[PDB]
Amino acid sequence: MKAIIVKPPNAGVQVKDVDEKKLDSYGKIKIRTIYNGICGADREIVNGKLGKDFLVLGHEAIGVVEESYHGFSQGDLVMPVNRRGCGICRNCLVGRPDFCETGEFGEAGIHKMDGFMREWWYDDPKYLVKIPKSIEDIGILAQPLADIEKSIEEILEVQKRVPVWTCDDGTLNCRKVLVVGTGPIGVLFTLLFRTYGLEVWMANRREPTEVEQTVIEETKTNYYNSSNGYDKLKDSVGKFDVIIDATGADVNILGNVIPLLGRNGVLGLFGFSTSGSVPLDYKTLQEIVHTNKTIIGLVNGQKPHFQQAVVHLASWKTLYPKAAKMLITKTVSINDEKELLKVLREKEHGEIKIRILWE
Amino acid sequence: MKAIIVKPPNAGVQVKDVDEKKLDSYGKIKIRTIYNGICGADREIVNGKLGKDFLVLGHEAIGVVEESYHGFSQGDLVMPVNRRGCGICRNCLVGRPDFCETGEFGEAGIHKMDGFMREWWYDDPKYLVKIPKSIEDIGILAQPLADIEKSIEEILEVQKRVPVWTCDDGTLNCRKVLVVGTGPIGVLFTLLFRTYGLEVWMANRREPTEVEQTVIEETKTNYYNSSNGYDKLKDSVGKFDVIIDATGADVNILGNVIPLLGRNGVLGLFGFSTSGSVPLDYKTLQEIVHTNKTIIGLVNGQKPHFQQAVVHLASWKTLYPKAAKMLITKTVSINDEKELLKVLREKEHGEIKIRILWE
Amino acid sequence: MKAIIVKPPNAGVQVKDVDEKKLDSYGKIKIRTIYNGICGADREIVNGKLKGKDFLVLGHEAIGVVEESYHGFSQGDLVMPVNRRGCGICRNCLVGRPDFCETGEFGEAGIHKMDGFMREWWYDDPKYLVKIPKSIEDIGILAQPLADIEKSIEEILEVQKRVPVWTCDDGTLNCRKVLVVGTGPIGVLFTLLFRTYGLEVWMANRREPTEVEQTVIEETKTNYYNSSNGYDKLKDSVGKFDVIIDATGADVNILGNVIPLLGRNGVLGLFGFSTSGSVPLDYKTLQEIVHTNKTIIGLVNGQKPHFQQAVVHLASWKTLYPKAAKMLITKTVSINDEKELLKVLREKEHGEIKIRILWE
Amino acid sequence: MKAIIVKPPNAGVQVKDVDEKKLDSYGKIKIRTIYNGICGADREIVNGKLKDFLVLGHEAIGVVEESYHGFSQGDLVMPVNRRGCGICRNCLVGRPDFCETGEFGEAGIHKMDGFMREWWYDDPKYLVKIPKSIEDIGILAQPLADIEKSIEEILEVQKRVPVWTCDDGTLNCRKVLVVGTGPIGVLFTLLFRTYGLEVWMANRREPTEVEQTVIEETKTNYYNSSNGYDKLKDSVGKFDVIIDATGADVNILGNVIPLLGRNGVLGLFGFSTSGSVPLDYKTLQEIVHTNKTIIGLVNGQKPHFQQAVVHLASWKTLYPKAAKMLITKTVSINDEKELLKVLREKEHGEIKIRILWE
Ligand SMILES: NC(=O)c1ccc[n+]([C@@H]2O[C@H](COP(=O)([O-])OP(=O)(O)OC[C@H]3O[C@@H](n4cnc5c(N)ncnc54)[C@H](OP(=O)(O)O)[C@@H]3O)[C@@H](O)[C@H]2O)c1
């Protein structure tokens, strides 16, 4: 069977025929892969930045059900949930390994579990998300969008601590979000916050790209060039109710944006920072106490979040059609090894999502 | 009228006769002061660290209702809520200026509002908490305890974000709290978390005082001498579900305890740190993201929290009688000006609460 | 100005020119009506079955066009007004939520205290206007009825936070089953929305499905039960339900028939306004409700956040359920077509979902 | 081993010596019984209205016989009475009050031997620590737990209301009608007043001495409902919460439903024993229009037992007179005539009878 494989912690990636008998199976439903997605997580493991001699790569997949099984019909499109439980803790027991207490969960194509960059795999209906045929083209985004659905859900849950966090009209339309970083993660946070009605400012240390400019205009989102810091933003628009680090940049980015967090606000740490040490002085911390501010680490979406992502992706085909069409940057055939290895190894500037087509 | 007065931002304090006609009144009910309490906030304003020529000091008070008015009867003991709303924002409009969005609230004895260190004042029933005569002796603690009630309420609300944060028995008994600092605040956090059944470790850079040892033994609380850091605690007991900074220590304390925070955990920032700059490196912040950790600034209790505090103080007379008896360190007469000035200007080592008696 | 007017408590309805000076104004933004919707509440007032003025402007479902570029509203923007407005006194109205008004002194456009939106134009306050994307102009009128249902489902889900674990083995609510009693617009919208959220749905009515219902059933993978001879057969085959919605408007004895199908920890959601009958609840039934943590909840009125959520869902359905989405608007009647307009104002046709009025 | 035994569904009760080998064990901790409580459920089984036999009783305080992990010799403990089915997700998180299978056990009622026996073995997970400082009234933590859960659930449900708090951020302005003034009604009243809500107790007679004490000490109101509720409605108006604590004919609900206020909650806690109540379309439509809710309230679990302990401790200070009245009397296990009598029938105005093991 053709599979894209890695050998962690070593760097490297290969597309090669492997013995199906040694690959991980998870249930009774045979699924033939049609699309994989690639993200920075894949790039990390390929570059060695993170029994069996290898691991099947990939945690973003859409496949077709080969034979009808219980609720699933032949020809149905499905997406597997990538993080799976430890089987010990109560959070995993209720289907929520995003809050696993042991840290002994598996992550497909990353840790403990063969991923989905292979011709076909067997899975359990428990871990399969139904992808409507009507979103086959952009449906691969339901996996990354799921992490973002969970994050926004959690931020909203946490803000229930505030007696009234709604606005004069009972909505959240008056709440302002600063999304720091404009890769696929930043763009998806922006799309989803705007879907919920909150005001959004995207920030990056440059002018917008073509894709970003389309998102700006279509979603009625604001943009700030942060190249020379945030003073000018603070002075013009004031402070923000929510700030999202969609970075993975130097952690000093936090020192820059923390002064822009407003009373009762939330700083959501979603990016995985890769460098730096950020100093927080007593004046900054004292002020966080006085104003009921919160900092939250945000990670991993689960099945309900995948299902919510599907609904939102569907909505965006109507609401934000130009942005929706730009979510897929390009598609590489599994049979185009030179190009395939290229895109597995490194991101292109302004890339949103690269899809792998199985054919 | 005798009053304790300060003149911010300048240091200094005076006990003198002032013109009653110029003092702030808040409603129709005349209250004669019997007790005030003193805390670090009073010491700070007296020491110049934080229409009218002066401000009446003091935000912790019990008084007696001089004449019956609606629900309040002559002879009833009452305590005023100290932070009052800005009259503009939706949080203040629902009786919750602890979450004021404008920052234009008042704080008795600190900001905008004359406090309660004066022979009598007029207040509105809406801002008065009924103090049962059976807790007259320790009832003064309801004001500081209210901040702690609000804080624990808030932590427990935030933790609803975790699908299952309860234990195998449906309780929080398995959850571990590290209370850093053992002043009145640390002691009250410890008493209240033990009341709720969570396991508690108190930490300070020394061995326990006699009062702290009584609390330890009576409440079945653990203690850790953190003089040489937290490695030995971490190795023996592991990580904590909740960590409270009750310090008002250099912010580098956060650097010492953040590595002891467990998965899905909460760092509650309650103390107002007064020096230092703490570095947070990328490894620390990335781990916060991976594990759904949260940092929350905790401030100010409101009326429901004062009422809850009354119930808990009442409970502690039965549950923790020895600790309850040690909550009041000494009482100083309003007429003993030398001793009064002494205790207004500086804390005594091991002090929990000084009461001022009006007579 | 042309308006559709009624004179409660009397029956009757007229389309006539009325004095603009007489009609209620709510703010500074001039909005020109393009569409109205008609619902049962409108029918009831027209049939006479539901101070300072000789008449009331009918209608609480509307989409209008913004006449001038105001604050956050551009000329040509489509907007829908929120129909219930607060009492100005109570804490729930002061936070934008008169659905929970404590005084009962709220107003309801085209029903109670406030002129409706079946008129050429009206003035409104931006706070009460919901933006309707041009991309859903055709089905956007459904945002008003769907809002009541968004609120209702939101509330059911909030209430069920009482249950330590109401989610399923996979962390979803996919295993939860809903019985929606009654079809037509409300039942259909409840079914669409519950299916969007992933719960299993059975629709029930005392007959076989209409073509539109059949389309909804098949496209959304919903189940249907012919309840003509009661619910014994459903209970014996499928068992009990986690949520039951009364979308009836009929006799309250329907509740006697479906309460035996409510499962442990379940919610009976009362949304329809029952119009006849008395239902007896015996001690055995009530005791069992106590033993199983069951809840019965009165469900009423959506507010601005719910209107906004409805817009997103309606947009989603164009992709998820395109066949059903098209069938939501049964027909459009011109404001100028008087005989047809009076017909549709006075009576529902069998199988009707939504009739829209077009202002030309 | 001495034990109080019943043979459901048949009527009857005996105190006899029974083969210890036959009795149910639940864990490794040996607990020697000191007190039991008796309630209506006990009387029902005794009267045949609800192994060859079942050990009666689900209200117990026992003493830990040896020092175990977390439990010192001489410690007082109370067992949680309802235990899970081991299958469903609610049971698996320690909350069989919400069991989805109905295959839970209840000590001294079904599936599980009770605690009216000399001693039993239990699992530490099911034991609630009872402070020595509340030994005297501690037996009430079991019935109070059902009520702690009930109020918790009402407050959870009312989060659906955007603002259910008052002008001062409290619930002091919220009014509760507690219908029925038995041990349950009294405990509801005490707990709601502890939380600061206004309470009206109602019964179809004037108050007993004990009820009058609770009324006066807690500043609770009382309404004689002998001739219906119109007078109360005319004077006080409507209520935010109504608790049925009667166990009487369901037509009580028809009388009190018209007194429920906008956004209000009718809490069904009592187990009604007769009747049928008609609900007309006018009443039901009005419930829809005003966001009203009716909720079935049942069973407290471990966190609720622990909360009950704290509140009982608080009442020794807050409401000392009422607290001293919660225990009506104590009967020795060795006084068989009086013991059989109290197992078989409630005395008028009784709150709680305790059985002492000597
Ligand atoms: N927590 C979770 O569950 C989760 C899930 C998925 C991903 N992630 C993490 O989320 C982060 C973002 O993912 P991604 O795939 O969107 O990353 P990406 O493609 O690398 O994009 C990063 C974005 O940040 C911008 N940026 C870099 N430094 C900046 C700065 N100092 N200020 C403002 N913007 C700056 C970059 O600008 P240019 O476009 O000019 O390069 C780029 O637009 C990564 O750390 C990823 O690992 C977390």
Ligand SMILES: NC(=O)c1ccc[n+]([C@@H]2O[C@H](COP(=O)([O-])OP(=O)(O)OC[C@H]3O[C@@H](n4cnc5c(N)ncnc54)[C@H](OP(=O)(O)O)[C@@H]3O)[C@@H](O)[C@H]2O)c1
């Ligand atoms: N957020 C709010 O609403 C709110 C309300 C009230 C008070 N506060 C703040 O809460 C903090 C505590 O108040 P308090 O009255 O208890 O203060 P306090 O009387 O000054 O007590 C401070 C405690 O921390 C101990 N400590 C100092 N450095 C430490 C370290 N490095 N590690 C561990 N313990 C250390 C002190 O030790 P020793 O006993 O050896 O001196 C003392 O026990 C203050 O900053 C106060 O301003 C906040």
Ligand SMILES: NC(=O)c1ccc[n+]([C@@H]2O[C@H](COP(=O)([O-])OP(=O)(O)OC[C@H]3O[C@@H](n4cnc5c(N)ncnc54)[C@H](OP(=O)(O)O)[C@@H]3O)[C@@H](O)[C@H]2O)c1
């Ligand atoms: N709570 C709120 O905020 C709110 C808002 C809007 C509407 N409502 C109420 O919601 C209800 C439904 O509205 P609608 O506009 O959908 O009403 P509708 O057009 O009258 O439709 C009612 C449906 O119920 C069916 N039905 C009648 N008797 C039945 C029975 N015994 N069993 C099962 N189905 C039965 C009817 O069958 P046929 O199709 O064969 O006639 C029809 O499909 C009405 O009472 C309305 O006033 C409440």
Ligand SMILES: NC(=O)c1ccc[n+]([C@@H]2O[C@H](COP(=O)([O-])OP(=O)(O)OC[C@H]3O[C@@H](n4cnc5c(N)ncnc54)[C@H](OP(=O)(O)O)[C@@H]3O)[C@@H](O)[C@H]2O)c1
């Ligand atoms: N849901 C649960 O988890 C749970 C837990 C424990 C108990 N319960 C049930 O809760 C109910 C109350 O328990 P309890 O032990 O307090 O019962 P109880 O001792 O029988 O007390 C019943 C009270 O209701 C009064 N009453 C009777 N009819 C009345 C009426 N029409 N109006 C007003 N009051 C009336 C009785 O009056 P008199 O004093 O004059 O007789 C008595 O005060 C019972 O049904 C019990 O089974 C439920």
Ligand SMILES: OC[C@H]1O[C@@H](O)[C@H](O)[C@@H](O)[C@@H]1O
């Ligand atoms: O491995 C950590 C995270 O990596 C991301 O790329 C995935 O989208 C998440 O599902 C995962 O939890």
Ligand SMILES: OC[C@H]1O[C@@H](O)[C@H](O)[C@@H](O)[C@@H]1O
């Ligand atoms: O002034 C800030 C804080 O000071 C503390 O001493 C009081 O207890 C708080 O209620 C107050 O909000």
Ligand SMILES: OC[C@H]1O[C@@H](O)[C@H](O)[C@@H](O)[C@@H]1O
């Ligand atoms: O019963 C009052 C209700 O009438 C319905 O027609 C409307 O859609 C609701 O918004 C309104 O609250």
Ligand SMILES: OC[C@H]1O[C@@H](O)[C@H](O)[C@@H](O)[C@@H]1O
């Ligand atoms: O309905 C059964 C109930 O009986 C009551 O007497 C007990 O206090 C509850 O714990 C139990 O759940």
Ligand SMILES: [Zn+2]
């Ligand atoms: Zn990915």
Ligand SMILES: [Zn+2]
């Ligand atoms: Zn786990």
Ligand SMILES: [Zn+2]
């Ligand atoms: Zn103080």
Ligand SMILES: [Zn+2]
């Ligand atoms: Zn304010």
Ligand SMILES: [Zn+2]
């Ligand atoms: Zn309508």
Ligand SMILES: [Zn+2]
């Ligand atoms: Zn109102």
Ligand SMILES: [Zn+2]
């Ligand atoms: Zn009992």
Ligand SMILES: [Zn+2]
């Ligand atoms: Zn169970």
